[PDB]
C-alpha cells in the first residue's frame, strides 16, 4: 500500500498471526489449543522459545 495505511512486511499483527499459524504445525505431542478462534498475536521471542 501507500499513503498512511501501509501494512508492512514486519507488521506485529500479521507476524503474530503467522507465528500462531506456524505453531499449529508442531509435533503431535505438543499441546496447542484453539489460538485461531480467539485472536492471538504471538511475538517472535515467545514463539522462538516455544519452537526451541
Amino acid at each position: 500500500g501507500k499513503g498512511k495505511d501501509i501494512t508492512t512486511k514486519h507488521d506485529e499483527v500479521v507476524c503474530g498471526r503467522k507465528n500462531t499459524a506456524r505453531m499449529e504445525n508442531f509435533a503431535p505431542e505438543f499441546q496447542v489449543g484453539d489460538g485461531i478462534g480467539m485472536d492471538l498475536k504471538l511475538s517472535n521471542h515467545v514463539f522462538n522459545a516455544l519452537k526451541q
Binding site: 500500500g1 499513503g3 501501509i6 508492512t8 514486519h10 507476524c15 511475538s43
Partner: peptide, 14 residues
C-alpha cells in the same frame, strides 16, 4: 527488533 524495523519501513513507505 520487529517494532523498530516496522516503524522505519512504514516511514520509508509513506
Amino acid at each position: 527488533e520487529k517494532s523498530r524495523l516496522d516503524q522505519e519501513l512504514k516511514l520509508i513507505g509513506e
